Structures are given as structure tokens and as C-alpha cells.
Write a protein that holds these residues in place. Structure first.
Motif, short mmCIF file in Angstrom:
data_model
loop_
_atom_site.label_atom_id
_atom_site.label_comp_id
_atom_site.label_asym_id
_atom_site.label_seq_id
_atom_site.Cartn_x
_atom_site.Cartn_y
_atom_site.Cartn_z
N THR A 193 -1.99 -13.46 6.23
CA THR A 193 -1.54 -12.32 6.97
C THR A 193 -0.25 -11.81 6.37
N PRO A 194 0.72 -12.64 6.09
CA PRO A 194 1.90 -12.11 5.49
C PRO A 194 1.70 -11.44 4.17
N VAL A 195 0.74 -11.91 3.34
CA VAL A 195 0.53 -11.27 2.07
C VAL A 195 -0.05 -9.91 2.30
N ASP A 196 -0.96 -9.79 3.28
CA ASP A 196 -1.57 -8.52 3.53
C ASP A 196 -0.49 -7.56 3.91
N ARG A 197 0.43 -7.99 4.80
CA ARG A 197 1.45 -7.13 5.32
C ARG A 197 2.40 -6.68 4.24
N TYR A 198 2.87 -7.62 3.40
CA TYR A 198 3.84 -7.26 2.40
C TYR A 198 3.23 -6.31 1.42
N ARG A 199 2.01 -6.63 0.94
CA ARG A 199 1.30 -5.81 -0.02
C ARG A 199 1.07 -4.48 0.58
N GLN A 200 0.86 -4.45 1.91
CA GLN A 200 0.62 -3.20 2.56
C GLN A 200 1.84 -2.36 2.38
N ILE A 201 3.06 -2.90 2.56
CA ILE A 201 4.20 -2.05 2.41
C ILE A 201 4.25 -1.54 1.01
N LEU A 202 3.95 -2.42 0.04
CA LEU A 202 4.00 -2.04 -1.35
C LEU A 202 3.04 -0.93 -1.66
N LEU A 203 1.84 -0.91 -1.06
CA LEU A 203 0.95 0.16 -1.42
C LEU A 203 1.51 1.49 -0.97
N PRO A 204 1.90 1.69 0.28
CA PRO A 204 2.49 2.95 0.59
C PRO A 204 3.71 3.37 -0.17
#
Lengths: 144, 594, 210, 290
Positions: D209-220
Motif C-alpha cells: 500500500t505504501p508503494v502504491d501511494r508514493y508512486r501515485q504521488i510521483l505519477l501526478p
């Protein structure tokens, strides 16, 4: 039980019923007075009208032209089997195709006035029994 | 606000499909994708645009159609193009000839391998050989890469052998022999050590270590994709029983896990990865997201569709439905455009889809009720003037009957008449027509401008049909004329012209002007058709009116007042005989006296 | 009367109205409005007026369809099939074509009709539809036979059974006498007479219903 | 027709500009109504619809329909006036109060945003306010993703707002004038300060979950950078140089991103694409690294 036999039975029964239908004329039917759906006006019976006039064909002028001179006698008629019409003026006779009109036949055989013409069936056993119809033509002197 | 922005966009896109439909009809060679690419250039679309170019390369890029091979080609060509452009711009102009090899030497030398040159490559005579082979390979120039190795001065030479046959074959260099041997060497010698490019060449060509990634020289997302694509082995993968097989499916899943749209950053680029990866469905769905621009997703789908993909509405992929739902937005407002979009459904040739198309159109006609536009209009002899659908053609008669019957349920008369005209059920039209004109005739007065409505409608049909080979029943036509005559009587009744009204009414031959023949008018009354039987009420009282006003007792010679007096008398006897079979207004009496 | 068909109903009767309605629906060169309306009348009758139904007898629909079927076939039905065939090829094609239209019609709207008065209606309609198809099949075979060299085989083939064969009526084929036809058809195929596509069709036929 | 709705839209704008309402609670209601109205007017349609309408106008061959464009124009005029006034009010408000009402106001700002993209706003808004504040808030975004765990709860508030902020930023970048304003605000700097990119996410709740979240910030954020880059003239322009610096400085992340899986993969995949677009869009990051 079988549907196939069943269906056959139904049709046969119905066929029988169709055949049994009442006789067209009976005195009892209009003993008091006749039921009539009678309008004076064409197409007055809107939905019901038994007959309509599909077309009108005039006598071809080519045919009429050889009817122009007629002192003595005129007459015309339709031959039912032939689907042809005939015109007699004096000695000559014309037959014209109902459907075509362009196609007309002329008799030059008759010498004299033509009193009457008629279409008749051939006898059961003569040399021409085969022909579909015979044309009888009577003049004062002869019948051909 | 208002957003003319999209509507303009809507129209631009609609325009393009429209031209596309014209081409299909006219057997033209109009490319859909070039058309978007042209428009897409403008911006944000710089993603969507790249997506389109990817699809376009695919134009007739079948050429057979191998998923990974084409994806590879696109990436490889893109790199080559990039390389050519850099070379194509100053320098030296490179000193030597424009050969592909030199172009790449330039990329490697001039481009960012050196800020001011150096570090960890193997270099001979000023040139990183392995980097060169790698990039040439990247470009898709395998043959040249092979040649470089040949000339190389190297000492892993067994590898040299394995490069050449990899090249010779379909590029899935599968020797029943050595591949195994190459793998062992990689693990022992190469794997733990060496020059990054050398490792890349070994790994990529060999498919040496399926755990995947190249340390130092993966510099771009596309570099990332290309590498992965190189690794998969589709053909005869199933054969041979090692588990060193890497499939497109496996590749596709990795892209899904987390890698996620976020991970493929440039989210911009993710779209492209989906197309290249063969996740068309996902690709449309993904395009389906920002502003997805439902519009964009729809058209892209259309483009994949032209490509003959779609081989088996935010998340609804089926082509028919994707199109249909798109139509929902505009259909009421722009039914024509809707037709154009529905028509695309056929682009997927086969039954099922065809019916889906037909059903969709049928559904469009129904409930939109844009009959004239969709179905057609006015004969003036000259059959129908075609509706938009008719231009497309075929099942149109059955739809009409369906719509028309429905009109009958609702009682949407006019629509029914309109529909039946198209149906060419002339008799039916007049009959419905007689009914419409018949009522509205009986009623109360103050109406009938001389220009438009049921009466006007009546005039249209009669003039129109009757002269021409009239298929209607005589009876049906007769009532029709009567209704028209009665109407003309109305026009002239009031607006003066008292005298004229009597003349016309008498012509109708409905009402006893003569003697006490009023009763014959009784006998002929019950016989009367339902439509007329209803109208008589006004016929009477119109007569006693004109009759009254005209016979206003005059001032101070032949004045035959007697007639136009006898007429009232006969009329009253008539009215007297049928009051029960009439609405119940023998208030003829009021007008009768004074 | 298409717009009001009560008048027809009144004079003629419901059954006859249904039958005519069926013919108009099927009838070719007709306006869509007419066909659809007639279909609607046939299927649903007049809404909130005349209802179309089995009552604890069979609905008018059944009688209408059956009447239609009976009337078309009436001439041929009793007559002996073989004498050469009793009926000419043109006639065979005519009957085949007509029945074909009906067959397709019923096949298409079979769902409505099929699927206790209601059940009885279902059975009766099912039976009729099967009958129409069966007639289609017999006529189809005859269409085949007309093509060629039927007469020669007939003369050679007929044996003791022959008396039974010659006094076979069309209805007999309609409600089939399977074994003789199968033998004959086999001979048609075995011998050269059937040409090309025809032959394939009989073999298909023997497989399907033989 | 949502003509009747139009009047309410006007009242809403009036109240907001007035900024009466002790309660931000009241203004949250105004923001919500406006949001729906803006969304409602343009049922999801995309550039294709607009192009079709223009063609039809084409010219009024016969009787055209240009109804939706006309409606958008009326909305935009109303909005403009009231607009300058209200923009001031809406942004300040923003910050505070209402971390709550926030979810509502940021969403209102983003819808409004498409429409009235283009125009108008860019100029007004620019200036002010927003940019300065929004860039600074990027830095603080990084810090805010950590504080993210805590506040998972206060998360509800902020997801409605932080995501909305990223969206607002991405939208401004999509157009030429907007991208310029963001870049002027010193986007790259704030991003450097956030230090979101200059690190490795894996280094480090269930870990995926944390990887998804962090990567999510990175994509935007990565999309925002790519959009700003392309949206100017990405070539010789200054923008190209800035983006290249972005890639090189944050290199190896780009490389690292290229391989692996999960929903996390999905986010990773999108991030990878985004870097690729950044790469080609600039001078080919590879091309530069000759």
C-alpha cells in the motif's frame, strides 16, 4: 397426440367446413325483401366495393379506320375464351387482341354482309376436334 | 461559461467520422489516423498524438501482425528517427558518410555518453564497441550490429558465434544446440562484473537471465519497454521444457501490477505503453479516465476498430456499446451525427455486430422520434426524399411499421400519417387522415387560418395522391373529398360570402334543399359513414345562419324570399327527425326565429 | 380497413380476419405500414377492444393460420402425387415459394405463439408450424426431382410396393411415408441423376431426417 | 433545460463574491452547488463533440444546433464578472478554513477550470494568487504525503483537497499560458525542495500500500512536469533545458522505474510512461546524453 397428425386433422376438418358452406341462392333468404347494401354513389361503398375499374382501352384507331365505311351494318362483341374483341362492318370482320390492340386480324374471306359471328367448341370427333375453338360466321348466303 | 471549446471539438471529430463514412461509401483511401494526427498536434494531445502515431504505424501493419514484433519496430524506428535528427543538424555535417553506423557513432559520441568524455566503457580507437552494438540493436539495425562485433577485437568470441544465427534466423535464435552453453558462461563470467552494454547485449540476445532489468543503461521508458519486448519469446516457447520462457502475457501483467499508470510517468506515457503492450482494452479504458475525453476514447476505439482489433460508458469496452453510449450525449440534439457514429458499428464486419447496428438505429429512431430527419419526407410523387439512414440504406420499411404502430398506441397522429406515407400505405394514410380532419370539423367555430394544419394536411394529400395512379379505395377518397368540400364551406362561411355558402352546401347533396325530401335524407343518414354522420350537426345551423343573415328582411322588383325559406323549413324537418342521433343542440331554433 | 378492421371482423368473423391479416403481413410489395399493422392485428388484435384468445376452443390466430394453410394446399392436398408428377414444375416452385414465406414467418415469430387453454393453444400452434415446415421439406424434395431424370428411375424402381406408391397423395407426403422416400432418394443419389449441389442436399436430408 | 438552475448559479456566485456567511459552511454549500452546475452543463463530451458542432454550424448550411456552445458562453460571461471578485475570495478562503470546506472549494475550482480555461481565468487567476501559493504547497506536498500517514484520517479531508490541488496544477499546465505561470512560480524548485523525486521510494502499514501511494504521488507530479515541458515550446526553448535537468538530476529513478509489478505495477507503468514522454519531449534525454 402427434402434432403432425393433429395438424393434418385440423386442416382437413376446416377444409370440410369450407366445402359445406351454404348454397348461394335460397328463396328463404329474401322471401321478405332484399338485404341490400346499395349506394347510388361510385366508390360509395368504400371498403366493400365489389368491383373497381382497372383500365379503359380504346379501340385502336388503326382498327377503326377499317370500319370507317359501313353502309349497311355494324356490330361488335368480345369473345370470352379468346380475350379478343371483334368488329363487324358489312362484309369484313376484325379481331383484335385485348391485351395488345396493335395486333389485329382481318377476314378477307367473306364476300357478303356478315349477319352474325360466334365462338363455338369443336365436335368430339371430327377432323378438327383438336382445335381449341371454332369461329362460326353467318352471312346472308352462307355459314362459314 | 459555455464551453464552445467542446462542441467545436465535438464537431471537428464528427466531421472526421463523417468524411470517413463518405470514404467507406465511396471506396476511398482516407486515413482516419492521419486525420487525428493532424489535429492532435496542438496540445495535451501530445500523448494522445503519440498514441495515434503508434496506431498509424500499424496501418496495414499487420505485414502479418505480431504483437511484440510491431511494438519493437515502433520503438526501434522511433529511436532511429531520433538518431537521424540529431545527426541531421550541424557538426562534422559529420565528417564521414551518412551511413547508419556512423549516425549511431555520432549519437554515442556527441550525445550524452560524454559531458567531456569518460567512464567504464570498453573502448578501442575512441569508440565504445559494446555501446555501439547495443544502440545499433536498439535502432533495429541488427545486421550492422553483427558486423561491428565481427570487426570487434574482443575475446568472448564464442558469443560472436551466438550473435550470428540469432541474426540469421527469425531472431528467435533457437539452436537445439548451444544456448545452454552461452547461458552458463553468462552466469559465471559475465553476470557478476562487466561493462553495462556488454551485459545488455548478452542478456538481451541470449534471454540469459529472465529476472529482468539492465543496470546502467536503461535510460528511457521506451528503452524499458523495448528491452522487455526483446526478452519475450513467443514462438516455440511452449516447445522445449525449460522455464526460461517469458511471455507477452507475463509482460502485460508486470505492466499492470504497480506498474501502474503512476509508474509509467511521462501519467502521460502510460497510454502508449498500453497500446504497445497489447492491452487495447485497458488502453481504451485508460484513455477513458482524465478529460478521458469520452470523445477521445471513443475515437481511438474507432481507430483500433479500423485496424480490425476488438477481437473479443466509463468501463464498457464493446465497440457497439462504446459507440452507442457516446451517442447518448448528443442523440437528441444531433440525431444525424448519432447515425454517423452508429454506422461505424458495421466496421466490425460479421453478423451480431450488424444486428447490433440495426438495433441501435432502430432504437435511435424510436424515442428520438426524429422521423423526418432519420426516415425521410414528402413525396411530390418522387418517392421519399431520403433520410440520413436511407442514405446508409436497407431495413427501413420494417422499422417504419414498427414506429408507426407505436405512434398509434400513443395516438401521435400526424406521426402516424407521416410514417404511413413512407410506408406507402396510401389507403391507410387517407383513412387516418379522414379521421383527423373529420373531428376538428365538428366542434365550435373561430379557427382555420388559411395556411397550415390538418385541413392543410388534407389538401396536401389529395392533390398529391389522387392525381397519381391512386391506390386508395374509392370510398375512402370520396369521404376525403367531402371533408374538403365541407372545409371550403367553412372558409367562406363567415368572412362574408353568405350566398356562396348555400351554393356549396347544397352541392354536398347531404342536406335537403328541395321539397319535403327531408325524410329521404333520413333514409340516407344512417347509411352515412361514421366520419360524416358526426359532421352533420354543423352542416345544419351553418345553413340556418346564412339562410338567416342573407334573408335579413330587406328594406323597400323580384324578391323571392320564399326560397331560402323553404330551405330552412326542410332543414328543420330534417333536424327534427334526427335530434336523438345528434349531439343535442336543436338550438337551430334560436337562429331560426327572430 | 387496415387503419379500422372491426367492420371486417363483424361481417367476416374474427378467424377470417386473422387469416387475412396473416396474408397481408406475409404478402409481398406491400407498404411497411400495412404489413406492420396487419402483423400487429394478427399478434395482438385490437388493443382494449378485440382480444386475441383461447377460451375454455382455439384462438382465432390458430384458426386463421390453419385456414390459410388449408386453402393454399386445398387443390393438391387430396390429389395423387405421382402418375411423372401430377403437378408441373412451375406449380411446384410456386407452392414451395409460398410455403417458404410462411415457414420463415412462423419461424421468426414462433416465440410469441408457443411457450389448459393457453397450453392447448401452444400445442396446436406448435403442431401447425411443424406441419408447415414438413410441407416445405416435401416440396423441396420435389423441387429437386423436377430437375432431371426422375421418370426413368421411377419406372425401373417400382415393384410390389408400387401400388401403394402410386396412390400416394400430397398429404401423404405432408404427413410422410418415410421409408419409401428414403429408398427412392438413395437411388436418386446412388444413380447419376442428382447433379452437384442437389446431391449434397439429399445426403444432408437423409442424415438429418432419415 | 437547466435554465432554472442557471439562476441559482448566479445567486451562488453573488453570495461567494460578497463572502457574507460567517460560516465557511455556508460557502461550502455555495461551492458544492456551483460544482454540480458546471459539471451538469457539459455532460461528458470530448473534443469530438465540439468539432461536430462546428462543422454543422458550416456553415449554416441549413438550421444548425449550437446550443451547448451557447450555454457555455453564457456561463463563462457570468462567471467572469463575478470572477475577479470571487477568485480572490475563493483562494484565500482556501487555505484556511476550511480544510474542510476544501474539499468542496478545490473541486469547484477544478470544474470551473475546465471551462473557463481558457480564458479568462488564466489571466486573473495567475497572478495572484494562486501561483505562488500552489507552488509552495508542492513542497509542503511532499511533507504532506508523510504526514499522510497520520493524518489517514484527516484524509478524508485532504484527499478530497490534495488530489484536487494536483489536478488543478495539471490542468493549468495543459495550456500555454498556464504552464508559463506555473513554471514562473518556480515549479522545478519546489519539486526539488519537496525532494519527492530525489530519493528512492522502495527504501522506506502493508508495504504494497505504501508503494502504491508514493508512486501515485510521483505519477501526478511527473505528469505536471511533462505537461509544463511540452506545453511551452519543447525544443530550443528554455523549457527543454529545465526538463532535461530534471531528468538527469533525478536519473536512475527513471531507470529503476522501468521494471516490475502489481497495482503498484500499474502505477509504476504509468510513471514509466510519463518519464518516457518527458524524455522524448525534451531533447531526447538519450539524445542529449550523446
Amino acid at each position: 397426440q402427434e402434432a403432425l397428425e393433429n395438424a393434418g386433422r385440423l386442416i382437413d376438418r376446416q377444409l370440410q367446413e369450407d366445402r359445406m358452406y351454404p348454397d348461394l341462392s335460397e328463396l328463404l333468404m329474401v322471401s321478405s325483401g332484399m338485404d341490400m347494401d346499395y349506394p347510388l354513389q361510385l366508390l360509395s361503398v368504400p371498403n366493400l366495393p365489389e368491383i373497381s375499374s382497372i383500365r379503359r382501352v380504346p379501340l385502336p384507331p388503326e382498327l377503326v379506320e377499317q370500319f370507317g365505311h359501313m353502309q349497311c351494318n355494324c356490330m361488335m362483341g368480345v369473345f370470352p375464351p379468346i380475350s379478343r374483341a371483334w368488329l363487324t362492318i358489312d362484309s369484313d370482320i376484325f379481331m383484335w387482341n385485348y391485351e395488345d390492340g396493335g395486333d389485329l386480324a382481318y377476314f378477307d374471306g367473306l364476300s357478303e354482309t356478315i349477319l352474325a359471328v360466334g365462338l363455338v367448341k369443336p365436335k368430339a370427333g371430327i377432323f378438327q376436334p383438336h382445335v381449341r375453338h371454332l369461329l362460326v360466321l353467318a352471312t346472308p348466303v352462307d355459314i362459314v | 461559461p459555455g464551453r464552445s471549446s467542446l462542441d467545436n471539438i465535438e464537431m471537428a471529430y464528427a466531421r472526421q467520422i463523417y468524411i470517413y463514412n463518405e470514404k467507406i461509401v465511396n471506396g476511398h483511401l482516407q486515413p482516419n489516423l492521419v486525420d487525428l494526427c493532424a489535429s492532435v498536434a496542438e496540445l495535451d494531445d501530445k500523448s494522445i498524438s503519440d498514441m495515434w502515431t503508434m496506431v498509424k504505424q500499424m496501418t496495414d501493419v499487420l505485414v502479418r501482425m505480431e504483437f511484440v514484433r510491431q511494438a519493437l519496430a515502433y520503438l526501434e524506428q522511433s529511436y532511429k528517427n531520433y538518431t537521424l535528427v540529431t545527426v541531421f543538424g550541424n557538426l562534422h555535417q559529420l565528417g564521414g558518410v551518412p551511413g547508419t553506423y556512423q549516425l549511431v557513432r555520432s549519437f554515442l559520441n556527441i550525445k550524452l555518453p560524454a559531458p567531456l568524455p569518460g567512464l567504464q566503457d570498453g573502448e578501442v580507437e575512441g569508440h565504445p564497441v559494446w555501446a555501439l552494438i547495443y544502440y545499433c540493436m536498439r535502432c533495429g539495425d541488427l545486421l550492422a550490429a553483427s558486423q561491428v562485433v565481427n570487426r570487434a577485437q574482443h575475446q568472448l568470441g564464442e558469443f560472436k558465434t551466438w550473435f550470428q544465427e540469432y541474426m540469421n534466423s527469425k531472431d528467435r535464435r533457437l539452436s537445439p544446440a548451444t544456448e545452454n552453453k552461452l547461458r552458463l558462461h553468462y552466469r559465471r563470467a559475465l553476470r557478476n562484473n562487466t561493462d553495462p552494454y556488454k551485459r545488455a547485449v548478452y542478456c538481451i540476445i541470449g534471454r540469459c537471465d529472465v529476472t529482468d532489468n539492465q543496470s546502467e543503461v536503461a535510460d528511457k521508458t521506451e528503452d524499458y519497454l523495448w528491452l522487455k519486448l526483446n526478452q519475450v519469446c513467443f514462438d516455440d516457447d511452449g516447445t522445449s521444457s525449460p522455464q526460461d520462457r517469458l511471455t507477452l502475457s507475463q509482460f502485460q501483467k508486470q505492466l499492470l501490477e504497480d506498474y501502474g499508470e503512476s509508474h509509467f510517468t511521462v501519467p502521460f506515457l502510460y497510454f502508449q505503453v498500453l497500446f504497445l503492450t497489447a492491452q487495447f482494452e485497458a488502453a481504451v479504458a485508460f484513455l477513458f479516465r482524465m478529460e478521458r475525453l469520452r470523445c477521445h476514447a471513443v475515437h481511438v476505439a474507432l481507430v483500433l476498430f479500423e485496424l480490425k482489433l476488438l477481437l473479443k460508458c466509463l468501463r464498457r469496452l464493446n465497440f457497439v456499446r462504446l459507440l452507442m453510449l457516446y451517442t447518448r450525449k448528443f442523440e437528441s440534439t444531433d440525431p444525424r451525427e448519432a447515425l454517423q457514429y452508429f454506422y461505424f458499428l458495421r466496421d466490425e464486419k460479421d453478423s451480431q455486430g450488424e444486428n447490433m447496428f440495426l438495433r441501435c438505429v432502430s432504437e435511435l429512431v424510436i424515442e428520438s422520434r426524429e422521423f423526418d430527419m432519420i426516415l425521410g419526407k414528402l413525396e411530390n410523387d418522387g418517392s421519399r426524399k431520403p433520410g440520413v439512414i436511407d442514405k446508409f440504406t436497407s431495413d427501413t420499411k420494417p422499422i417504419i411499421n414498427k414506429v408507426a404502430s407505436v405512434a398509434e398506441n400513443k395516438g401521435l397522429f400526424e406521426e402516424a400519417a407521416k410514417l404511413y406515407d413512407l410506408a406507402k400505405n396510401a389507403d391507410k394514410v387517407l383513412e387516418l387522415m379522414n379521421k383527423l380532419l373529420s373531428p376538428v370539423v365538428p366542434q365550435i367555430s373561430a379557427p382555420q387560418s388559411n395556411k397550415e394544419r390538418l385541413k392543410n394536411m388534407a389538401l396536401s394529400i389529395a392533390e398529391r395522391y389522387r392525381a397519381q395512379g391512386i391506390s386508395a379505395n374509392k370510398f375512402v377518397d370520396s369521404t376525403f373529398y367531402l371533408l374538403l368540400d365541407l372545409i371550403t364551406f367553412f372558409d367562406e362561411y363567415h368572412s362574408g360570402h353568405i350566398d356562396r355558402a348555400f351554393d356549396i352546401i347544397e352541392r354536398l347533396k347531404l342536406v335537403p334543399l328541395n321539397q319535403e325530401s327531408v325524410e329521404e335524407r333520413v333514409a340516407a343518414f344512417r347509411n352515412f359513414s361514421d366520419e360524416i354522420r358526426h359532421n352533420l350537426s354543423e352542416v345544419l345551423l351553418a345553413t340556418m345562419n346564412i339562410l338567416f343573415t342573407q334573408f335579413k328582411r330587406l328594406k323597400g322588383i323580384e324578391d323571392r324570399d320564399s326560397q331560402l325559406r323553404s330551405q330552412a323549413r326542410t332543414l328543420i324537418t330534417f333536424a327534427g327527425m334526427i335530434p336523438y342521433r345528434t349531439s343535442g343542440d336543436t338550438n337551430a331554433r334560436l337562429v331560426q326565429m327572430e | 380497413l387496415l387503419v379500422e378492421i372491426e367492420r371486417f371482423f363483424k361481417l367476416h368473423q374474427e378467424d377470417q380476419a386473422c387469416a387475412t391479416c396473416l396474408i397481408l403481413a406475409c404478402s409481398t410489395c406491400d407498404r411497411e405500414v400495412s404489413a406492420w399493422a396487419t402483423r400487429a392485428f394478427f399478434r395482438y388484435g385490437g388493443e382494449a377492444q378485440m382480444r386475441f384468445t383461447t377460451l375454455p376452443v382455439y384462438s382465432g390466430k390458430h384458426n386463421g393460420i390453419c385456414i390459410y394453410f388449408s386453402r393454399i394446399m386445398g387443390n393438391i392436398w387430396d390429389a395423387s402425387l405421382v402418375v411423372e408428377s401430377s403437378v408441373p414444375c412451375q406449380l411446384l416452385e410456386s407452392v414451395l415459394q409460398e410455403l417458404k414465406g410462411l415457414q420463415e414467418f412462423l419461424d421468426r415469430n414462433s416465440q410469441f405463439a408457443g411457450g389448459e387453454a393457453q397450453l392447448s393453444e401452444k400445442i396446436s400452434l406448435q403442431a401447425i408450424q411443424q406441419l408447415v415446415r414438413k410441407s416445405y421439406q416435401a416440396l423441396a424434395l420435389w423441387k429437386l426431382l423436377c430437375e432431371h431424370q426422375f421418370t426413368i428411375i421411377v419406372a425401373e424402381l417400382q415393384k410390389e410396393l408400387q401400388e401403394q406408391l402410386k396412390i400416394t397423395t400430397f398429404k401423404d407426403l405432408v404427413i410422410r411415408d418415410k421409408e419409401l422416400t428414403g429408398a427412392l432418394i438413395a437411388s436418386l443419389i446412388n444413380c447419376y441423376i442428382r447433379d452437384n449441389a442437389a446431391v449434397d442436399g439429399i445426403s444432408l436430408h437423409l442424415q438429418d431426417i432419415c | 433545460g437547466d435554465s432554472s438552475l442557471y439562476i441559482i448559479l448566479k445567486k451562488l456566485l453573488d453570495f461567494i463574491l460578497k463572502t457574507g456567511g460567517g460560516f465557511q459552511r455556508v460557502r461550502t454549500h455555495l461551492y458544492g452547488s456551483l460544482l454540480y452546475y458546471l459539471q451538469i452543463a457539459q455532460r461528458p463530451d470530448e473534443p469530438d463533440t465540439l468539432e461536430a458542432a462546428k462543422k454543422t454550424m458550416w456553415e449554416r448550411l441549413t438550421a444548425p444546433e449550437d446550443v451547448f456552445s451557447k450555454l457555455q458562453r453564457e456561463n463563462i460571461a457570468i462567471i467572469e464578472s463575478y470572477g475577479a471578485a470571487l477568485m480572490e475570495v475563493v483562494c484565500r478562503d482556501a487555505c484556511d478554513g476550511h480544510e474542510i470546506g476544501r474539499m468542496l472549494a478545490l473541486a469547484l475550482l477544478d470544474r470551473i477550470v475546465s471551462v473557463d480555461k481558457q480564458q479568462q481565468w488564466l489571466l486573473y487567476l495567475s497572478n495572484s494568487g494562486y501561483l505562488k501559493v500552489l507552488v509552495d504547497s508542492l513542497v509542503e506536498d511532499d511533507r504532506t504525503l508523510q504526514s499522510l500517514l497520520t493524518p489517514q484520517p484527516p484524509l478524508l479531508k485532504a484527499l478530497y483537497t490534495y488530489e484536487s490541488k494536483m489536478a488543478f496544477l495539471t490542468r493549468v499546465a495543459k495550456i500555454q499560458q498556464g504552464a508559463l505561470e506555473l513554471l514562473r512560480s518556480g515549479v522545478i524548485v519546489r519539486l526539488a525542495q519537496c525532494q519527492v523525486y530525489d530519493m528512492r521510494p522502495e527504501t522506506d502499514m502493508f508495504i504494497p500500500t505504501p508503494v502504491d501511494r508514493y508512486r501515485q504521488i510521483l505519477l501526478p507530479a511527473l505528469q505536471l512536469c511533462q505537461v509544463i515541458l511540452t506545453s511551452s515550446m519543447a525544443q530550443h526553448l528554455q523549457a527543454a533545458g529545465q526538463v532535461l535537468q530534471f531528468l538527469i538530476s533525478h536519473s536512475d529513478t527513471i531507470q529503476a522505474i522501468l521494471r516490475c509489478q502489481d497495482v503498484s505495477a500499474g502505477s509504476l507503468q504509468e510513471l514509466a510512461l510519463l518519464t518516457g514522454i518527458i524524455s522524448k519531449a525534451a531533447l531526447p534525454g538519450i539524445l542529449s546524453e550523446l
